[PDB]
Each structure stands twice: as C-alpha cells, then as structure tokens.
Write a protein that binds this DNA or RNA. Structure first.
Lengths: 77, 122, 80, 66, 83
RNA sequence: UCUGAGAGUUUGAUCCUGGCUCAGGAUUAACGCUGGCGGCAUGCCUAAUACAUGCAAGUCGAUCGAAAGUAGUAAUACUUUAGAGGCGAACGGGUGAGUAACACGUAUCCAAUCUACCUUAUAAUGGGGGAUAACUAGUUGAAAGACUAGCUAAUACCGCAUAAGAACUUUGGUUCGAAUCAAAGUUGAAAGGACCUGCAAGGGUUCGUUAUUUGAUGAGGGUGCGCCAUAUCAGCUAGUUGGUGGGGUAACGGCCUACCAAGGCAAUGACGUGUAGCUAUGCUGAGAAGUAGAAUAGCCACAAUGGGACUGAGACACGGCCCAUACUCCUACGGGAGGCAGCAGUAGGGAAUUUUUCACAAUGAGCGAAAGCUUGAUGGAGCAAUGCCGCG
C-alpha cells in the first residue's frame, strides 16, 4: 500500500476538526451579527476574519468581499 | 407456512426478481414449509442480468416470511416479506452479496456459507 | 539525453520549477554536445540575464558551463 | 542460512488406502504450525475437511513441506 | 488604464424584453474551399448600458465587457444615424 | 528554381461517353520462402476484459521527543527511526471509451480573475498556554484492533500585546462601468535551528518564521474565427429568456434562490441519429488538394462502474477517503482485504507485437545544509528483417 499517505490521512483529520471548529465559531459570530447589528460585533468578526484569511483556511478574497458587504449594509445609517 | 404454488422474492444478487414455488422438498403431503426448507421454484419475471431464465425450474431455499414459527427461545420472530436464497444442490449460492435479513435457525441444518456472506444475521 | 541512440545530446532547456522535459518552454538557451566537453555552444548571453531578472533559478547542473562563460561576473550586481 | 546438520529432507510413501491421505494430512496437522504450512493454527476446531481423493490430491500438489 | 475594446457593427433585429435587444450582423468572408466569399449570419442579445437607447430600425456598434448575465457580455455603445 | 508519361478491356471492322484492371509508392501488416551481421527506429490498430509476485514515492536525526542499541564507570561520542511535525506525494506514466464542442487551434478582453516555493526590495522574529503521536497499564484478539487512564517533545495548534505595509470605511485629486493620490473611523504576526563571537549580558552568519511589491510561472472565464456526416432527423427548448433582491463563488455570469414578466433558437439546417479524443502532423499527388490522426509533441478528458466529499497554493486525486454497484481474495466464519487504460507479465480474444531483465552512470523531478537518498522518469541490453540503411 502506502505509509506516508496514512500519516497524511490522519494528519489533516485533527487539522480539519480544529479548522471546522473555528469555522463554525465564525459562523455563530456572523449569526449573532445577523440577529441584530452593532459596531462591536462587526469589529470582532472582522478581527476573526483577519486571522482566517491570514491562514489558508479561508480565502482572502472571500473575506474581503464579505466584509465589504457587511460595511455596505451597516453604513445605511 | 409457505403456500403451494406461490410467488416470492429474492434476497441476494442473482439477477432474479420474482420467482414462484413449484414443489416443496420433504415428506409426502407436508403442505407447509418452514425456515430452511429448500424448495423447487420457477422464475415468474426477472431482469436479464441473471444466470438463469424465467419459467425454467430451479432450486432455492427460503429465508424470509411474515408468519415465521416459534423457535425454541420462547419469543416469536416475524417479518413482512417472503424471500429466497438460491443454491446449487449444496449449502452455498452463486450470489456474492446477500441482502435483507437472514435468520439464525438454519445453522443446524447447514447453509453455513450464507451466514458469513450475510451483511447481518438476525 | 536525446537524439541518436548511444550519441548523447542535451539542449539547455528552460524550466522554472515544474515543466517536465520535452514540452513547453519560455525560451531556448541554445544547444550542447555532451560528448566532447569544451563548452562549445551558441547562447544568447541575454536569455540567462532574462532568468536573472525575474528568478526561476536555473538548473543546478548546467551551472558549470556558465561558470566557464562567467555569468557571476555579470550577476553579482543582482543584490547591490 | 545455517548448518545442514539440522535441515533434513524426508519422504512419505504408502499404498493408496495404506494411509496416503491419513498419514500425510494428519502429519501436516501435527507439524504444520508455521506460515509455510500453517494449516493447524487456522484449522484446529473447524469442520473436518475430507476433500475428494482426486480433488484433495490435486489441491495438495506439492514437493516441499519444510 | 488604456483598455482595448472590440467593436462590432450590426443592424438591430428586434427589441423583445425591457432593456434587452437582439442585433443581427452579416459578414462576407472567404470560404476556404471554393474561393467564393460566403455570407455568414450572427444574432446577439445585449442590454441598455444606461446612457443610449438602441431602437429598432437603426445600425449600432456593440462592445465587449464582463458578462452581465447569460448570453450577454456586450453593452450598447453607439447608434449611428439612419438614412 | 517549381510545373502532370501510359497500357488493356463492349464490337465483322470501326468511333462517343463511361466503369473496371495494371505499370507508382506507402503500413504499427500477418504468413509463406526463409535468413549472417552492424548500427536505425519501431513493435495491442484487436476485449475502457479481469487479474499473483518485484518495481510504479518518498524525504527531513543540523525540528524534536521517545525508546532501543555499538564503544562509554558516569557524562554519554555515535547509531536508527516505529513516531510527531516539515515538504512533496495534483508533478512524473499509459490509455483515448464516453465526448460534435468555445474540446481543439488562432486572436483575444480578463474595467472578473487567483497562484504557496523564485524574482527587486521592504516590514519584524515579544512572549504566553495546554493537548497529543510515540511510550505504559488494562478490556478485546493469532492478528485485527477499539475504549479508558497516566506520561511528554516540537517550526504542530489557541489566546495576549505589538504593528511598517495591507484589508475595511469617510473627505479631498483622476479614465476612455472603472483607477490612482493626502487624512483618518475598524482590525489583525510569529519560532525556533546551526554556527561563530562574547566570562556573561549581548552581537554577528545562515535556514526558517510573519508581512509587503515588482514580476514571471501556473490555472481558469468570455469573446470572433475555423474546426464530421446525415432531411428516410421539421420545428425544437422552458431557470428556458430578462431584470431586480439575496446568496454562493479565486472570480463574471439562472452559477443558485425568491418576485414577477414571456420568450429563445430555427430552412443561412436548428433539434436528433451514426460517429470522432482534438491539433500539429503521417502518407499520396505537379499543385490545388485527398486519405489517416502510428511512433513523438502540445491541449482536453478518463482512470472496475456511479455518485459525494476533505486535504493543501493547487485534486474531486493511476496506487488520498466515504457510500452504492460489480468482481476477486483472506479469514478463527468473528469479520475484513483488494483495484496493472504504472513497468514487466498472465488469462482470453486476436493472423498480428516482446523481457515475469539491468544501472539510477549521466540528466529530470521531490526531500535535504550536506553524506546523499527515492525514481520501470531516464538510459541499456533481450526478441522480431517490422521498415530505411550498410555489410558477408
């Protein structure tokens, strides 16, 4: 068979568990954003998106687009 | 409790879909068939991928029935379908994947190749 | 080695990191007859400067014939 | 490998129904405990398998049992 | 930001949907077999960019850009006057 | 410089048109007849039929634990990696079945793109935290192994603080549906090796860390163009056509959803059937052109069959996963294991194609500072007159 593949197979499983944990953390944060809008939560979610685009977990372009949409909809004031 | 001249289904990969009993093996005028009783059957209709034709006389044991019978345990087991496992004058089939539920009150009468190939034994 | 069998030949080909041999290339440096070693070959002397301008580090084995040519003498100004 | 003093090549000859199947099969059962034969520790308590004389003799076609 | 633009001249065929028009073009080009220039025909759907009005019965120029939607990648550029 | 040879055939004889046949080459050609050799290239066009064994991908002990071992009283010098973590494993191979098209090839806009490792140069490398592989004990077992508890290392991972520059936003200057410019509302990065020097504390060499810009490389989208046959395939299609809102998306787009509106294409051959990997090219002809799509190359696409997903720059992945289908194999009958259209090779079919072969010597790719390692990539030899070529 192959040995390093199995090492790679189990290597990213824990990585994926952690990454999906933080992804659903971002998910519940943006859900709290969806419930009602404030400056503080928007800043927190932007701070988290900075880390997530910083890592390879989340594409930088997607984070930039989502933050642009969020600022666009909050600037209705 | 299998009626004479009655159709039934199959519970393994054989290309058979609807087969009908013709005669039951055993003593003269038994008139009823219990679990494990191999019978002579005839295919009513099936898809052409099977290794046998339709209508031609063939040989298969029965696996499922809603009636069942009281096994020695003291608690009765039932089903809702009548199915068969197709064999070749032995205790083994041609089929490679057995499907559906299979009982346990057949090991004493043989057919031990079925239980190992069964996905789950009931 | 290509060409006539039992007669080695090695064109100096262009590859950044991941171009398999005998395929697309950005520029042909020249030719080489690796049977009699004297660095007798025609080169542009500017295509290597083309690599030196934007990276894509050259293959580590063709380095000796360029040492005979002396590409460092025109390359040392890469970081000044 | 090692000295030949321990390595020993033997043989079994018997008339048919003088114990071809019995002697050969049961001796393999007694001795064949290693992956070269390994028959005993995979068939101790299994159902006894007395293959057809022709079939058993064609399936067990071999020249080395070490 | 000097962009290169592809401009095609055509005759408008119809206007069926709001701010969406079908324009027909016919091109006479050498047939590569019998040395006679054959006329090929193309139809193209476009939309109103927001500063000109492409109306039926006039010749227009159409220019390329990003796909706005399905089957449309082109904005109405300029209508050149009638006869 | 390039520019086309005839002959025969219906007839008592004799002429028009007209088919057929030969004189010319060319082949991945069998098989006769066979046959000395040198190079020279080639050697499933045929069942995308299923398949044993060895090879087809590893690498880092100068990132670490950790146990173990040669020499060591001891400290350990050294070994070696089952293991974590780092990189790569998607690149490299062969097949061409389904694909009739934006597949291909060309020109293209990417005012819709992204690309880790390189490129010029910039910004920093503060510390903190706790699991866990491995090891140990046990249940369960020949193995498979799972489930608990204890033991930790690390460039693994999760906060704190800190931001040059970046994103995000507002004002002020710009271009033939956009871009640049000063100011600021918001926000975030990490690590230690290896060595030298220095009593030290520091400092330096260099890998790497985290950030930035030039680039290029790579991938993807649209566009015009050209790129089979068929009328004994006449109408065909309804997220279909259009926009809006919202969503998804490296990214534009009915890509997707909600709301409605009603088309869209077509006799200038759509739609459907046979059929095809495409192209460059091979052969033939004086050419125009016609045949084929051998080796070789580029693009696309597949990978026992059909779907669904994660990984990382990058895959829906020959030998990464899950399920189903179909098949094979092992078994302790408890339960599992497996994917040659990788190399050889087998079985069958087939008139018709080889070695169950060798070196990683050079070069290519991956890892590494290096010793170098891995490589059926690569190169050799084996068989064959299969073809061009020399030569008894």
């Amino acid at each position: 068979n192959i040995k390093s593949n199995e090492k790679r197979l189990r290597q990213n499983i824990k990585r994926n568990l952690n990454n999906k944990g933080q992804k659903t953390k971002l998910k519940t944060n943006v859900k709290n954003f969806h419930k009602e809008i404030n400056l503080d939560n928007l800043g927190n979610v932007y701070s988290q998106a900075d880390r997530l685009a910083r890592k390879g977990i989340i594409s930088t372009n997607r984070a930039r687009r989502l933050k642009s949409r969020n600022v666009a909809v909050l600037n209705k004031t | 409790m299998v009626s004479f001249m009655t159709r039934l289904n199959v519970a393994d990969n054989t290309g058979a879909k609807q087969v009908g009993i013709i005669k039951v093996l055993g003593s003269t005028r038994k008139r009823y068939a219990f679990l494990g009783d191999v019978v002579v059957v005839s295919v009513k209709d099936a898809i052409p991928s099977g290794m046998v034709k339709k209508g031609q006389v063939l040989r298969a044991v029965i696996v499922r029935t809603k009636k069942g019978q009281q096994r020695k345990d003291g608690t009765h087991l039932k089903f809702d379908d009548n199915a068969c496992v197709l064999i070749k004058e032995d205790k083994s089939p041609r089929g490679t994947r057995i499907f559906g539920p299979v009982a346990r009150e057949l090991r004493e009468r043989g057919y031990n190749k079925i239980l190992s190939l069964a996905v789950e034994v009931v | 080695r290509m060409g006539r069998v039992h007669y080695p030949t090695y064109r100096i080909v262009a590859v950044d990191s991941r171009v398999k041999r005998d395929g697309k290339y950005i520029a042909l440096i020249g030719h080489l007859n690796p049977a009699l070693k004297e660095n007798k070959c025609k080169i542009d002397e500017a295509v290597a400067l083309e690599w030196l301008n934007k990276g894509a580090k050259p293959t580590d084995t063709v380095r000796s014939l360029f040492s005979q040519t002396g590409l460092w003498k025109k390359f040392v100004e890469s970081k000044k | 490998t090692v000295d030949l003093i321990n390595f020993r090549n033997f043989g079994i000859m018997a008339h048919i129904d003088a114990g071809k199947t019995t002697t050969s099969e049961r001796i393999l059962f007694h001795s064949g405990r290693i992956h070269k034969i390994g028959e005993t520790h995979d068939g101790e308590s299994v159902m006894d398998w007395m293959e057809q004389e022709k079939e058993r003799g064609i399936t067990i076609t071999s020249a080395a049992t070490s | 930001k000097r962009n290169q633009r592809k401009v095609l001249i055509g005759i408008v065929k119809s206007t069926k949907n709001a701010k969406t028009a079908t324009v027909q073009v016919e091109s006479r080009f050498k047939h590569p077999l019998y040395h006679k220039s054959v006329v090929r025909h193309k139809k193209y759907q476009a939309h109103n960019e927001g500063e000109v009005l492409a109306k039926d019965g006039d010749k227009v120029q159409i220019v390329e850009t990003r796909p706005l939607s399905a089957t449309k990648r082109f904005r109405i550029a300029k209508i050149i006057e009638r006869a």
